[PDB]
Amino acid sequence: QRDLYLSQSKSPPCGGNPTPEMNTFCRTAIPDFISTVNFVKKQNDDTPKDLTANQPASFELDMPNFDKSSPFYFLNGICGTVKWNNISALNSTNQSDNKG
Amino acid sequence: AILQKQNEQLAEQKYQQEIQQRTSDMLTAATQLVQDWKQVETQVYTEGT
Amino acid sequence: AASSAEQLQAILQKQNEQLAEQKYQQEIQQRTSDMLTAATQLVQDWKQVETQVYTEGT
Amino acid sequence: TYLNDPVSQAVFNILGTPDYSFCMDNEQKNWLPNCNLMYQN
Numbered sequence: 001q002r003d004l005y006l007s008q009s010k011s012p013p014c015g016g017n018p019t020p021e022m023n024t025f026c027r028t029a030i031p032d033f034i035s036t037v038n039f040v041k042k043q044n045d046d047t048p049k050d051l052t053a054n055q056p057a058s059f060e061l062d063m064p065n066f067d068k069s070s071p072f073y074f075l076n077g078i079c080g081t082v083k084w085n086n087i088s089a090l091n092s093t094n095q096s097d098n099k100g
Numbered sequence: 101a102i103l104q105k106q107n108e109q110l111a112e113q114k115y116q117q118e119i120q121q122r123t124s125d126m127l128t129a130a131t132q133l134v135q136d137w138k139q140v141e142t143q144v145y146t147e148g149t
Numbered sequence: 150a151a152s153s154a155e156q157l158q159a160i161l162q163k164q165n166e167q168l169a170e171q172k173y174q175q176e177i178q179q180r181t182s183d184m185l186t187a188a189t190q191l192v193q194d195w196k197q198v199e200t201q202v203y204t205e206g207t
Numbered sequence: 208t209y210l211n212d213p214v215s216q217a218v219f220n221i222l223g224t225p226d227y228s229f230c231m232d233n234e235q236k237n238w239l240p241n242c243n244l245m246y247q248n
Contacts, residue, residue: 009131012233019234027124035172036114040161041107067114102162109165 002030028071036065039084051098055090058083 005014005026012018014026042061062077090096210216228235230242 015233017232017239019232019236022233027128029120029124031117031120032172035110035168038106038110040103041110044103044107067117069117101158102165106161106165 002026024071031070031072033064037061037063038065039082051090051096055086057091058085 002025008014013022018026039059039061042065043059046059047055060081060083062081063079064072064075064077066073066076210219225244225246227246227248229244230238230246232238
């Protein structure tokens with residue numbers, strides 16, 4: 001669609017007097033979505049850096065994945081969404097420290 | 101180990117859009133520059149009375 | 150109890166190298182598409198020949 | 208300036224009196240502050 005648009009620079013939609021968001025669309029190239037979806041980093045973000053605390057029970061990653069500055073943030077979750085819980089080895093009482 | 105390296109790779113990818121935004125910007129500017137140097141205004145003759 | 154880390158470091162480093170290879174691969178084809186778009190326009194320019202013009206005097 | 212024959216003025220008006228969508232934006236929501244082009248409305 002973007003190629004069809006840029007081949008038609010004049011003769012709007014990409015020409016004439018576009019509405020601002022469609023100007024940003026003509027401006028904005030398409031990122032690669034399969035490079036953004038990564039569950040391990042999202043896991044690390046969910047779990048607290050401190051480990052003696054109780055880990056979150058569930059983890060919800062929606063794909064596509066995007067950063068907040070990305071204009072495609074509302075696309076997040078268009079292609080389904082995936083969940084997984086944690087391992088019960090930490091929620092129960094168990095000594096755990098990263099010092100040693 | 102290499103988990104956190106992959107972490108910072110995708111972090112580096114996800115802080116890396118200033119490049120592409122100004123990229124797209126100056127393509128839009130540049131093609132207009134290409135067009136207005138490709139322009140050639142043809143000479144005109146005025147034959148006196 | 151001494152076999153649970155090495156294989157997973159191995160396999161995550163596999164997924165890293167294969168995704169790196171995968172990106173290298175399709176950027177090859179992507180720029181290939183942009184400059185097929187270039188190549189075709191160039192060849193249409195070359196096949197053009199403007200017919201000469203006669204301008205007979207008074 | 209204008210043409211030299213009133214009937215051909217009428218013809219050229221039928222042929223080239225533009226629409227509001229050209230004083231308009233692409234999505235038909237608001238006009239440009241400037242429309243020097245003469246159109247039907």
